């Protein structure tokens, strides 16, 4: 007959593979076919990716039909046509946007999301791939909890940061300390960040030697802080530019406060 | 040029016009200051000169490199220019979602053009509501003397207000915000 | 009653012979006839070979019929004709492209892929050779797991590589490190390469002596790395050029980035 | 020529025209520099001259030899030249899949024409759908002042995107830093 | 004669014509060089002179002996000549299946005549398919300037291609092969 | 025995090692010899190019 790939109730299992404030990964192994992976990542926007990963790669680009088929143990219920996708050659199947959340929802109702398409490896015959809802509820609760505990900013949002200092003292302002805490959280949870560039520089109020001394003291304090997060010393770079290179009109009270600033630039190895 | 005058000309978008008005006599000085001293105002000026090819030859990659260095040091106008280049697809491949962070940083530093452009992008669904508050805040305590721009800012403020609850609006209007 | 070579349910067995990230091989011994071998290799594109290896080699070039015959324990099912091949004299039977995947698919459905042809060693009488689907599914799962873990590039894809160095220090850029890691994976699993040319260059920042010294330093570091990968010293030929022979305009930092490069060429002779 | 002058001439595809204008006085200089010291820019120039018989007698075989000599050195223009010759069938037998590996290296070097032609070949089914991500990345990070080239790159990007899951498109658009 | 000139004349099949053109004045030198120094070119020349009885008397056994000695040392033309003698029954009893190894070795060394004759013999079922690949390989990367011979080589290549699977053909076209 | 009784092998440009194909043919010869006990005589005649000196060539 036809080839249907689904996990029987004795085989169906869901796992939370990545559970960190930077990524969530819920994986359902489809026996004899591959994996179904839901991934959510720390970001400012709602994002979910569903990837149907196949052991044998996609032979050709095919139109795929996504249906919400009821399980066998639900007589009298009809199937809902969800949508039509396109699975591309030598790529994992991808569903994103509202449809991935809809797949999760149809699994929450106890149904089977079924992808139907003509398989190139199977003499161009129609095959079905279903996601089992058996043992889904607890892992969906864990997935929702992890999504709740996701950072509301990505690497793009913090990779470049400019912080400001108070008029009198060596401490950062309140907002600058808050942004530094955000940077520290992202760094402490991300192991792929390799480079930190720190460029402190100050206002023209003090003397040139005094400006350089203040800038270097601030740079060394920030370098020690970045060391405290766990990065090795060979990765952090710190430089104090004193009162040179002003970005704002020195002399105005606001301009001097602008120039009293530090640049922090992160660099990752994805 | 002095650094302060160059910065003020950059903020007014007349640095290129001024350099043309000088009949490009200080080009060597600009090149030396940008390349060797790494002065952010001169880096931005040299990048704009190279990018759009005024007097100096048109070298888009090198001009964008020097603009990016001015941004590296943190010139708000450089960040705004890179953001609007990405948002409008000028000399770069158009990516508004990539434009958003640059505009956000420039707006947070105090660039009014960046604030207006960021609010416009957000109102076109090119970001997340998790920005509205800040953007609204940045549009709330911003003083302009142009009546057209004032009306535009008020319109964008109302557009953002129609999308956040009273709790978040109250928190936004009730925060320490400067520039 | 003609000759039919098939493994009985008690005789059928499937084995994973080669299970490496460079090749997967699945073998079905057909008793009294030979083997049926499914071979897949690391490549940029989907590839599968089916080879019917015979103990007694093919006597004459014959037209062969490939059919998906139902097993005896499946009454009421008709046979699906798959295709017609040509088996050549003194060569193993070869099926490739989508037809080999079709054979695997027909085995996955409990059916018998049957090759029928006239055998020269058999007074030119028609004989059948069938592949048994007994004990196939577990080994098909292992074979597909192996296929999923194949390198997504072949030797042709790492033959000629230009890597770049950073502005400060003697360390490769991120992309250059990634490409070097790909080369390292393939070399680690193959080691057949017989020519490793490592020509290093520098930018125009340093003097001629300093640039030459730095280029030779990095060349010898790469040579030591390639030796650590297992290649013999004789196959490696490193050469430092220093600031000489620029490829870009050294007047711009972009040009200096392009000029701090290393060219690694890998050559091998199949014969 | 110094070499940077020659490299800049080559990058603008005007080196042969330059040698023609100079009334074929550079002939022996070019030959000596190419075959004696093996300067890649001079090697490419000599190979081009031998290929088309400019200021010298035409020698297609040796012309391609010297073009290859320049390509293996690292010159972005010789690599693109070899890839374009293999793809078009100029001076050699036409071979797209042989071309692609050469075009890839020139595109990774920064060559805009190599990126465009690589995208055109991939959209014509002359490579596995595993080179699409790199081609899209290269086109995405491309900067140009020619509006025709800009539109071409954008259209090729869209064409490439019509064959990718959009979890690969997002991966192509990620960078290792804020810039 | 110098060794190189004699070798080139042997390859062109004009050594006997040249010796006749000299009115056979160097016969003593040829005999001394072949018999005493055992120079393969002179051994082949002396064997051909003795075998077909030009100037020198016709001694078939001794001529074939000296040709076989030239072959012993490894002159490809000697191997080809012995092979075609066996295949055509010239001065020896016709045994094509015995001719096959000689022609195969001469072809493997680079003799185009041996390659064509071996392919022709194989296409007449005078060998085994276990040769086709090599023979096909030897016919694939072989360069001739004669249009008639080029057409013949192409015909033989197609004749061999009609007898091997795509696997073996792919392996044959994808191997290191020279001469 | 007819297919391997006469073999001609080649050396690399620099070094004392045979080429790849020549090593493959030498392995074939070694297999046939190791499995055949009737082979009595082996004649080896090495000789080189004219690039080196006559004494060097002989060595």
């Amino acid at each position: 007959m036809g080839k249907r790939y689904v996990a029987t109730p004795q085989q169906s299992q869901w796992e939370m593979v990545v559970n960190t404030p930077l990524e969530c990964q819920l994986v359902h192994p489809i026996p004899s076919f591959g994996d179904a992976v839901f991934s959510s990542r720390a970001n400012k926007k709602i994002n979910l990716d569903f990837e149907l990963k196949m052991r044998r790669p996609m032979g050709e680009t095919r139109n795929v039909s996504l249906i919400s088929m009821p399980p066998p143990w639900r007589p009298g219920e009809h199937a809902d046509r969800i949508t039509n996708l396109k699975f591309f050659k030598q790529f994992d199947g991808y569903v994103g946007g509202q449809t991935a959340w809809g797949i999760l929802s149809e699994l929450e109702k106890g149904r089977y999301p079924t992808f139907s398409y003509q398989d190139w490896q199977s003499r161009d015959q129609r095959i079905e791939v279903a996601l089992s809802s058996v043992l889904f509820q607890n892992k969906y609760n864990a997935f929702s909890d992890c999504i709740s505990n996701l950072l509301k900013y990505s690497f793009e949002d913090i990779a470049f940061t400019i912080l400001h200092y108070e008029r009198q003292g060596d401490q950062l302002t309140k907002a600058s300390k808050k942004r530094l805490s955000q940077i520290a959280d992202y760094i402490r949870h991300n192991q792929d960040i390799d480079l930190v560039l720190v460029a402190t520089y100050t206002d023209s109020t003090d003397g040139k030697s005094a400006s350089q001394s203040l800038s270097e003291r601030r740079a060394e304090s920030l370098r020690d802080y970045f060391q405290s997060l766990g990065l090795p010393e060979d990765r952090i770079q710190v430089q104090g530019y004193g009162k040179r290179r002003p970005i704002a009109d020195n002399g105005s009270p606001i301009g001097k406060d602008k120039n009293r600033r530090v640049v922090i630039s992160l660099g990752r190895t994805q | 040029y002095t650094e302060a005058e160059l910065i003020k000309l950059i903020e007014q978008n007349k640095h290129l016009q001024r350099v043309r008005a000088d009949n490009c006599q200080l080009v060597e000085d600009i090149v030396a200051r940008a390349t060797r001293i790494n002065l952010p105002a001169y880096e931005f000026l040299y990048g704009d000169m190279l990018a759009w090819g005024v007097c100096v030859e048109q070298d888009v990659e090198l001009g964008l490199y020097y603009i990016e260095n001015a941004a590296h040091q943190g010139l708000p106008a450089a960040l705004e220019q890179i953001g609007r280049y990405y948002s409008r697809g000028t000399l770069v491949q158009q990516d508004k979602e990539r434009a958003i962070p640059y505009l956000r940083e420039a707006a947070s530093m105090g660039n009014l053009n960046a604030r207006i452009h960021l609010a416009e992008l957000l109102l076109r669904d090119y970001g997340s509501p998790l920005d509205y508050e800040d953007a609204y805040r940045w549009l709330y305590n911003s003083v302009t003397a142009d009546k057209r721009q004032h009306k535009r800012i008020t319109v964008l403020r109302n557009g953002l207000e129609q999308r956040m609850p009273q709790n978040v609006i109250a928190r936004a209007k009730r925060r320490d915000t400067f520039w």
Side-chain angles (χ1 to χ4, degrees), chain A, chain B:
Chain A
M1 311 175 308
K3 284 196 288 182
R4 185 167 207 256
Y5 299 98
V6 67
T8 62
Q10 296 87 343
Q11 301 182 316
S12 169
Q13 64 186 280
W14 290 81
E15 300 127 346
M16 278 291 300
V17 167
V18 186
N19 196 342
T20 57
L22 287 178
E23 193 182 4
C24 296
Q25 190 136 284
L26 187 65
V27 180
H28 172 58
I30 303 167
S32 303
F33 187 86
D35 294 337
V37 178
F38 297 92
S39 285
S40 194
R41 279 161 263 264
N43 202 347
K44 294 231 174 186
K45 19 174 51 185
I46 305 175
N47 63 108
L48 180 76
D49 295 1
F50 169 75
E51 287 168 337
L52 199 72
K53 312 193 169 182
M54 329 163 181
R55 298 288 190 263
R56 307 174 301 274
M58 194 66 178
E60 301 251 293
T61 292
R62 296 301 171 87
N63 304 126
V64 181
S65 192
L66 177 56
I67 316 280
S68 182
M69 218 79 62
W73 51 80
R74 280 181 195 261
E77 297 195 14
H78 59 80
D80 309 320
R81 313 230 200 191
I82 287 183
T83 188
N84 274 81
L85 302 318
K86 219 171 176 181
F87 280 9
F88 299 106
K89 185 181 176 177
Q90 301 215 51
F91 284 115
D92 300 336
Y94 175 80
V95 187
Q98 192 179 185
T99 23
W101 295 106
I103 296 176
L104 277 176
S105 169
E106 296 297 330
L107 277 167
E108 191 191 2
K109 297 173 201 166
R111 305 202 105 178
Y112 280 19
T114 303
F115 301 91
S116 182
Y117 63 95
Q118 289 195 335
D119 191 20
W120 177 86
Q121 277 95 351
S122 167
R123 305 189 52 233
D124 285 320
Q125 294 171 348
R126 203 199 60 88
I127 74 170
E128 294 189 6
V129 181
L131 311 189
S132 194
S133 56
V134 174
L135 294 184
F136 177 78
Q137 290 288 346
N138 293 17
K139 297 307 162 74
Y140 190 39
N141 287 147
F143 190 65
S144 297
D145 290 18
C146 88
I147 284 187
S148 169
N149 299 322
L150 282 188
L151 268 36
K152 313 255 166 291
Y153 52 90
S154 48
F155 184 88
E156 295 78 11
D157 301 314
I158 61 135
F160 181 87
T161 312
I162 141 182
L163 307 181
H164 293 54
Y165 276 86
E166 296 174 349
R167 278 194 170 96
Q168 298 194 17
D170 53 351
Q171 255 59 74
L172 294 156
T173 52
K174 223 174 183 178
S176 299
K177 286 183 175 177
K178 189 176 178 179
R179 255 118 71 86
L180 192 57
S181 63
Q182 288 185 10
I183 295 175
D185 279 324
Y186 194 94
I187 290 250
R188 113 172 68 261
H189 294 305
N190 191 334
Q191 300 177 351
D192 316 332
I193 293 184
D194 276 339
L195 185 58
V196 194
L197 307 178
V198 186
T200 73
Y201 93 86
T202 102
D203 56 351
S204 61
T205 297
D206 300 314
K208 198 167 189 174
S209 177
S211 291
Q212 184 71 26
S213 178
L214 260 63
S215 66
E216 290 188 356
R217 263 174 278 159
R218 297 166 181 185
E220 298 306 322
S221 70
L222 279 156
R223 201 274 309 273
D224 273 350
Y225 180 59
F226 282 139
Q227 286 195 8
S228 64
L229 298 175
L231 292 171
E233 184 181 6
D234 32 307
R235 303 288 176 79
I236 316 174
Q237 301 183 7
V238 285
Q239 190 182 14
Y241 278 112
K243 68 177 180 185
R244 287 168 293 122
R245 308 184 179 186
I247 72 163
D249 177 81
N250 314 269
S252 64
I254 47 184
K256 294 192 170 191
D257 203 88
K258 284 194 177 187
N259 290 339
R260 284 193 306 269
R261 60 186 230 73
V262 177
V263 187
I264 307 182
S265 297
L266 299 189
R268 55 128 86 98
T269 298
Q270 50 182 194
Chain B
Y1 299 103
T2 66
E3 303 209 44
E5 290 183 357
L6 184 53
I7 292 170
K8 300 176 70 62
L9 285 159
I10 284 168
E11 296 171 358
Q12 302 155 337
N13 188 32
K14 288 190 173 183
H15 54 307
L16 295 186
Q17 277 197 10
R18 167 62 76 86
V19 170
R20 264 171 288 171
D22 296 4
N23 216 325
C24 284
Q25 200 182 10
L26 306 171
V27 162
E28 52 183 38
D29 301 306
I30 294 172
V31 170
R33 292 173 188 265
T35 308
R36 309 169 188 170
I37 317 181
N38 295 332
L39 290 188
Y42 285 101
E43 279 181 307
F44 179 84
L45 176 62
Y46 191 20
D48 276 292
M49 283 160 30
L50 272 170
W52 284 103
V54 277
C55 293
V56 201
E57 288 299 327
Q58 197 172 24
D59 203 314
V60 188
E61 302 199 358
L62 202 56
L64 298 189
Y65 171 84
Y66 280 113
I67 294 179
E68 179 192 335
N69 279 31
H72 271 78
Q73 259 123 174
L75 188 61
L79 292 151
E80 198 279 335
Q81 175 156 334
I82 299 182
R84 65 179 190 93
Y85 279 170
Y86 281 139
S87 169
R88 303 181 184 271
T90 318
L91 298 176
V92 295
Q93 295 304 313
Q94 181 188 30
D95 202 9
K96 299 197 182 72
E97 207 69 44
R98 189 185 185 180
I100 290 283
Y102 301 92
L103 291 178
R104 199 221 317 272
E105 186 58 80
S108 102
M109 199 34 184
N111 195 323
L112 178 61
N113 293 323
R115 303 188 166 181
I116 295 183
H117 204 198
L118 175 67
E120 282 191 339
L121 285 186
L122 288 177
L123 288 187
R124 297 231 167 277
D125 303 325
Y126 280 110
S128 70
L130 298 186
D131 294 333
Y132 293 162
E133 189 174 352
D134 269 336
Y136 170 75
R137 187 187 51 162
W138 293 336
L139 286 186
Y140 198 61
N141 35 278
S142 182
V143 185
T144 172
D146 191 0
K147 297 183 178 183
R148 262 247 181 269
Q149 278 209 355
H150 181 94
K151 194 275 311 171
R152 192 82 181 113
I153 292 177
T154 290
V155 165
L156 295 185
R157 277 170 36 191
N158 296 17
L160 291 179
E161 276 174 3
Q162 297 298 98
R163 302 190 174 193
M164 5 197 306
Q166 290 302 326
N167 192 223
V168 179
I169 287 181
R171 200 191 320 121
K173 306 161 88 94
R174 191 176 45 96
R175 201 188 311 169
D176 148 58
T177 152
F178 21 67
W179 325 145

